[PDB]
Amino acid sequence: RECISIHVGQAGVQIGNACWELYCLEHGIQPDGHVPRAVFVDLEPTVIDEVRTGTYRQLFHPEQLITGKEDAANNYARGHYTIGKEIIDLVLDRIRKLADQCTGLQGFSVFHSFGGGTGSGFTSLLMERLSVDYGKKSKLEFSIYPAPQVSTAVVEPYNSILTTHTTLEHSDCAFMVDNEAIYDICRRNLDIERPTYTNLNRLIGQIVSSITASLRFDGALNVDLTEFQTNLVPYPRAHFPLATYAPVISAEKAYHEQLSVAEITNACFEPANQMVKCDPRHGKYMACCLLYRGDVVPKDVNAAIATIKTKRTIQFVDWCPTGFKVGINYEPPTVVPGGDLAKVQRAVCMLSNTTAIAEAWARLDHKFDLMYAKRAFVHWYVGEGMEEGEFSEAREDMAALEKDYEEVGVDS
Amino acid sequence: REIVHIQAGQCGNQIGAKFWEVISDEHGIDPTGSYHGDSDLQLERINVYYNEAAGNKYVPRAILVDLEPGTMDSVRSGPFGQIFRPDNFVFGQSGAGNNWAKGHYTEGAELVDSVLDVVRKESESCDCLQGFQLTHSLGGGTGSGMGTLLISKIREEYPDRIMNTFSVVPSPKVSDTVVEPYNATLSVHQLVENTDETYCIDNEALYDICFRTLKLTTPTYGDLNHLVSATMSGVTTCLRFPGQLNADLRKLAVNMVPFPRLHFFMPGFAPLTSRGSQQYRALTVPELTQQMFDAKNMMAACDPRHGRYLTVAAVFRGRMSMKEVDEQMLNVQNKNSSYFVEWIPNNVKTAVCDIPPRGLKMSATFIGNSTAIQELFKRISEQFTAMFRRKAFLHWYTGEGMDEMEFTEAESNMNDLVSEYQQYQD
Amino acid sequence: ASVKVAVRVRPFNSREMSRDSKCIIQMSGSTTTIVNPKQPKETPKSFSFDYSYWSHTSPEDINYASQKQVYRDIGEEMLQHAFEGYNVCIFAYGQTGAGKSYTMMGKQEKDQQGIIPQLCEDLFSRINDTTNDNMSYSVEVSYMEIYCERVRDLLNPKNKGNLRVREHPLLGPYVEDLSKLAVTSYNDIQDLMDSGNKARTVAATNMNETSSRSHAVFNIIFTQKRHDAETNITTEKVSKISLVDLAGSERAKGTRLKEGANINKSLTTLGKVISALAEMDIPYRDSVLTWLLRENLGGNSRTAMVAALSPADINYDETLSTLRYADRAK
Ligand SMILES: CC(=O)O[C@H]1C(=O)[C@@]2(C)[C@H]([C@H](OC(=O)c3ccccc3)[C@]3(O)C[C@H](OC(=O)[C@H](O)[C@@H](NC(=O)c4ccccc4)c4ccccc4)C(C)=C1C3(C)C)[C@]1(OC(C)=O)CO[C@@H]1C[C@@H]2O
Ligand SMILES: Nc1nc2c(ncn2[C@@H]2O[C@H](COP(=O)(O)OP(=O)(O)OP(=O)(O)O)[C@@H](O)[C@H]2O)c(=O)[nH]1
Ligand SMILES: Nc1nc2c(ncn2[C@@H]2O[C@H](COP(=O)(O)OP(=O)(O)O)[C@@H](O)[C@H]2O)c(=O)[nH]1
Ligand SMILES: Nc1ncnc2c1ncn2[C@@H]1O[C@H](COP(=O)(O)OP(=O)(O)O)[C@@H](O)[C@H]1O
Ligand SMILES: [Mg+2]
Ligand SMILES: [Mg+2]
């Protein structure tokens, strides 16, 4: 029934504090109410401390807040092997101590930031140690994969080609939200050149609320977590769909809010609104899980979608007749009291697997080579319990992820 | 986390006074007083530079190494001079001769053990050690020789903790000493092989940047020092503050050093406007990157425009949009694709603290790893040969128990170091 | 070729026997393929080298790559390069227990001697059988262990302390106070080998298991003195021969942070050097090993590496890693 969550890496923790905020906010549980149902991991104390100093301070147990005073290191190796190792046990312990206390759970919603040290590496083995300790569950990892041109870390790809290959054979469904492609939404669909990280977080903090929160919440067309991976992954590769939200209108500027279904659903497939720089440049969808929430008439959907199924310029895979999982919830969304999110009475958090990422992975793989081609910051990992193996052998890994996402599509 | 500063030589020392003059105020620590901190955040992370004893006396955890009493006895007899626990003063009343050899093999080699002693008392202080800060000048005895030894020993004692080095590489135009390239070439040698992050500053790159970027007409040393100390505060201490995207020595190290040499950077501060007038506030952000990335404004002597970059780290510290930050960096990376090296898709390492420099609204330290610094070790290396060839003031070295193969060694080494760096400019 | 690379697979060892391991390595010509035990229905990954030595069976087998065969392909040509006046290097690389020491030193008995004793024997044989009054020679030898950035003299039982590698300001790197012995015969250099090999495996070496965690370097300084009766003067030609038995490539768990760091650094650096050498048709100071052997790894020099491979399924990961490392050497 439940779904634990492990927010790993400063980012996964910032986003965590955010997604965790939106929660109580739409459940009437102020600062000090019940008890969360997740944990927080980081090898840099000062960040988890922000959850220990700032807002939502006492809504957590100093037990579900793991820290390694030591060093973060923007390098996979160190975070996965060398350092990150020391903490893992302890980490697990909570996701085994928190996993017990419950009643027939469904899985762990993992929150990490692909291209980091504590986020890429660590998790790599966290999800790793999970796939074995609970192979019998769902492993949906919600990632924030590398901005297409606006990356931060100098190494980023090293850290992301490595978190992909190690987690690939362990996740159930990996959701992806592109940090940059979300900015566009903040520039083009909300207008603000002042987007603090605290915003992107409010956003995913939204799209995510549509996943677990409301879905695990009764409705006219419930959709379990398992449901996802089933209706969402055509193949064992921990396939990565993309998150998209519909009423991303500004709560100040424009106001046409009352945008009946027929509109908000069409607003999902236009590439300028998908929290991912993977513009459907060719990527044929192969399965979409349209999660609606608020006042929505099933016919409105079983029509708004029909209209789409016949737009053709939206070309769905061949081997897939119908790939539209319609998830209907009741309670409308719940916008921050005064952030910058419109606040409509219905939304569409549609996520999907698109042959599109054939790109995004490509463009991120290429990156890697360029540097590896010169070993660039390699000495930083080797000296951290890794080898020419793990790199070269994780490169070959993704290689067959560029062929995979190619074969499962583009062909009939 | 933590670090333990090291004031090698007079310069490195003189600067200590300025690095601590600053940092303290950037942490509300009065002479011997405690934390008067205008805020409450300038305290949760202080440890990085102090120690708890009394309850109002957080003492800087640095080392003051020097073979010339008068110096430390000027730093200890002035302003903040009375905050260092006397135990910190590792003096060498000997003749602090201006010979690299006199402070690395003969005179300094003795005072070393009585230093390492303390560098251990401070390291084994508490919590977890990160690395050590090292200030000095590569143009003298107590600086290049004895300080370059202090590290060769440090890096044998904790090849784990990092080693940032702040070197005052011999300014071009005019040398404030004569053997300079001797004391220098010999210390850079030791650097390229122990510390793993070096920030090279040039007394004349400063003047310039201090007489034209600060209409300042009488730039006393105190100033130069002050400007420098401003950068080393943005680097370390800063990142030991919160931030949307914070880093720390390692991130800085693990994002800036593609190849083990250690490589040297060139620090640059952001708001560098003259007092009254200039106080233009054009600091939205494009103004800071405008600054940081220009030629002038690079504490180094060489000009970036004269050689690609391998890595860059804009360590900003003042509330800004992870969008207008992450964005700007890009155009910058495209307007100058020419010089920014290609085999690194994203050279730049954007870092973002929150709280800014006490009295300012928005700043951003720049730590550049450009291939341009090739054209400096060249300089140094040249000066050597031109004088080595004739063994100029060599008797002051050998006569101090040195080797004719020692000088050969260093030059070559550091000389090769020039070579390599070009391997990327191409 | 300035860089030659060979791989060699050995017979099952005791751990593999007790494990009932399957052989996952097969060879054909210059090609070595490796099967992923967890994926038997694939086509094996293929690799091509200057030589793929199949020594997984035994000398009783018609197709078994003997110590003699390996030496005559790799060692013999190296010695010839030394007689021609230039420096050479032969490295044995691979996982602990894969066959590095066996390939380099081998066994003390008949038929099992490695590259080092065969090369030494060949050298003295060519010298003593050199007929010419104008040609005289000198052979000097050194045998050491490089462990954690410090050097151990294997030819001096009381090597009192750990000698440092230093860089002479003009003549290059060298190990301070390291003993260099002049030998005038094979049985004599053979005596030194046995004596040094003995020191590598004494009981005290099991404390830090230096037999598998340090790099063993056997150096020979070969000097050829050429007299000339016309205008009466000798011209000296000096060749440096370095035969290396590297630390186990898997220690690059139970491995100390600094041992691992140094070993990784050493092997990683050596890899860059060799790939660069093969490129030419270089960060030497990055490790003590590559720093001490810089002169034997120059553009004039010649290098060869023999990568030892375990045959069993249980070592797939390390063996693949070794093959990739050899493939990069080029
Ligand atoms: C009324 C007002 O706003 O005054 C400003 C000011 O006029 C200007 C010109 C300051 C001023 O700085 C200088 O004139 C200067 C003198 C010698 C060397 C270098 C700089 C200022 O003195 C410096 C001072 O800086 C700080 O307070 C920072 O926290 C800074 N502190 C120190 O350097 C410091 C100085 C004395 C004692 C202890 C610390 C800092 C910067 C980075 C990291 C840590 C601390 C500031 C904003 C000002 C004055 C006071 C006029 C500027 O410099 C800095 C470092 O902020 C020079 O260009 C900038 C722009 C500022 O607006
Ligand atoms: N959406 C979003 N992205 C973030 C946030 N914080 C960081 N990121 C992104 O995630 C990556 C940064 O990872 P880091 O903060 O460097 O590292 P980490 O993953 O927390 O772990 P360490 O490297 O060990 O510190 C970059 O690509 C950032 O753009 C956040 O709050 N929200
Ligand atoms: N920025 C700066 N440079 C200094 C200071 N003092 C000496 N220098 C520089 O240091 C070099 C001289 O070395 P010095 O510090 O006297 O050596 P030592 O005292 O014998 O170790 C010259 O290039 C000076 O410009 C200072 O307070 N600030
Ligand atoms: N080709 C070979 N023929 C016979 N025995 C071999 C062969 N290669 C290795 N061995 C045996 O395998 C073991 C592993 O080799 P050494 O012991 O060479 O290990 P390492 O590679 O660690 O130095 C030794 O017992 C050796 O006798
Ligand atoms: Mg972090
Ligand atoms: Mg062996």
Short mmCIF file of N, CA and C in Angstrom, two decimals, chain A residues 82 372 374-375 378-379 381-389 392-393 396, chain C residues 45 249 252 257 260-261 264-265 268 272 316-318 320-321 324-325 328:
data_model
loop_
_atom_site.label_atom_id
_atom_site.label_comp_id
_atom_site.label_asym_id
_atom_site.label_seq_id
_atom_site.Cartn_x
_atom_site.Cartn_y
_atom_site.Cartn_z
N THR A 82 34.65 3.91 -2.05
CA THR A 82 35.32 4.54 -0.91
C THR A 82 34.44 5.11 0.20
N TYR A 372 36.71 11.12 -21.18
CA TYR A 372 37.35 9.84 -20.96
C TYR A 372 38.44 9.70 -22.01
N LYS A 374 40.44 11.42 -22.84
CA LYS A 374 41.67 12.04 -22.35
C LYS A 374 41.88 11.76 -20.87
N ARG A 375 41.01 10.91 -20.34
CA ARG A 375 41.08 10.52 -18.95
C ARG A 375 40.70 11.66 -18.02
N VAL A 378 39.99 11.42 -14.40
CA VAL A 378 39.94 10.02 -14.06
C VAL A 378 40.70 9.73 -12.78
N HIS A 379 41.88 10.30 -12.64
CA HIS A 379 42.65 10.02 -11.45
C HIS A 379 41.88 10.27 -10.17
N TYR A 381 38.86 9.20 -9.57
CA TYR A 381 38.04 8.05 -9.22
C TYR A 381 38.92 6.87 -8.91
N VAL A 382 39.87 6.62 -9.80
CA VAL A 382 40.78 5.50 -9.64
C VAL A 382 41.27 5.52 -8.21
N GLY A 383 41.81 6.67 -7.82
CA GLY A 383 42.32 6.82 -6.47
C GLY A 383 41.21 6.71 -5.45
N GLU A 384 40.05 6.26 -5.90
CA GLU A 384 38.92 6.11 -5.01
C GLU A 384 38.27 4.75 -5.17
N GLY A 385 39.06 3.75 -5.50
CA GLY A 385 38.52 2.40 -5.62
C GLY A 385 37.59 2.16 -6.79
N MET A 386 38.13 2.38 -7.98
CA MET A 386 37.43 2.19 -9.25
C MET A 386 38.53 1.76 -10.19
N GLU A 387 38.21 1.57 -11.46
CA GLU A 387 39.24 1.13 -12.38
C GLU A 387 38.89 1.51 -13.79
N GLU A 388 39.82 1.26 -14.71
CA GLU A 388 39.56 1.56 -16.12
C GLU A 388 38.37 0.70 -16.50
N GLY A 389 38.12 -0.32 -15.69
CA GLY A 389 37.01 -1.21 -15.93
C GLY A 389 35.71 -0.46 -15.81
N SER A 392 35.07 2.27 -18.72
CA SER A 392 34.93 1.63 -20.02
C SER A 392 33.82 0.60 -20.06
N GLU A 393 33.62 -0.11 -18.97
CA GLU A 393 32.59 -1.13 -18.95
C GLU A 393 31.20 -0.62 -18.62
N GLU A 396 30.23 0.96 -22.36
CA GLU A 396 29.69 -0.09 -23.20
C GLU A 396 28.25 -0.32 -22.76
N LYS C 45 33.25 -11.79 -25.83
CA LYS C 45 33.93 -10.56 -26.20
C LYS C 45 35.28 -10.97 -26.76
N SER C 249 46.91 -6.30 -10.18
CA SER C 249 46.04 -5.29 -10.77
C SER C 249 44.68 -5.13 -10.12
N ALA C 252 44.33 -2.27 -7.20
CA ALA C 252 44.44 -0.89 -7.65
C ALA C 252 43.22 -0.06 -7.23
N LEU C 257 43.94 1.99 2.27
CA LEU C 257 43.72 3.12 1.38
C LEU C 257 44.96 3.55 0.58
N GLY C 260 46.45 0.81 -1.96
CA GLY C 260 45.58 0.82 -3.12
C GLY C 260 45.75 2.05 -3.97
N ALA C 261 45.82 3.21 -3.32
CA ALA C 261 45.99 4.47 -4.01
C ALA C 261 47.23 4.43 -4.87
N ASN C 264 47.06 1.81 -7.71
CA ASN C 264 46.17 2.28 -8.77
C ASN C 264 46.93 3.35 -9.56
N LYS C 265 47.43 4.35 -8.85
CA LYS C 265 48.18 5.43 -9.48
C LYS C 265 49.30 4.88 -10.37
N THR C 268 47.77 2.93 -13.38
CA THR C 268 47.07 3.88 -14.24
C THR C 268 48.08 4.72 -15.02
N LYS C 272 48.99 5.01 -19.23
CA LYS C 272 49.01 6.22 -20.04
C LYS C 272 50.32 6.32 -20.79
N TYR C 316 35.97 -13.49 -13.93
CA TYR C 316 35.52 -12.75 -15.12
C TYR C 316 35.77 -11.24 -15.05
N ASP C 317 35.28 -10.60 -13.99
CA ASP C 317 35.46 -9.16 -13.83
C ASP C 317 36.91 -8.67 -13.86
N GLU C 318 37.80 -9.30 -13.09
CA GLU C 318 39.20 -8.89 -13.07
C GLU C 318 39.92 -9.21 -14.37
N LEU C 320 38.51 -9.47 -17.36
CA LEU C 320 38.02 -8.57 -18.41
C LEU C 320 38.78 -7.27 -18.24
N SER C 321 38.88 -6.83 -17.00
CA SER C 321 39.59 -5.61 -16.69
C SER C 321 41.02 -5.66 -17.19
N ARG C 324 41.07 -5.42 -21.02
CA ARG C 324 40.83 -4.03 -21.42
C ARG C 324 42.07 -3.18 -21.22
N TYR C 325 42.76 -3.43 -20.12
CA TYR C 325 43.98 -2.70 -19.83
C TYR C 325 45.03 -2.98 -20.90
N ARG C 328 44.18 -1.34 -24.22
CA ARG C 328 44.49 0.09 -24.23
C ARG C 328 45.97 0.35 -24.45
#
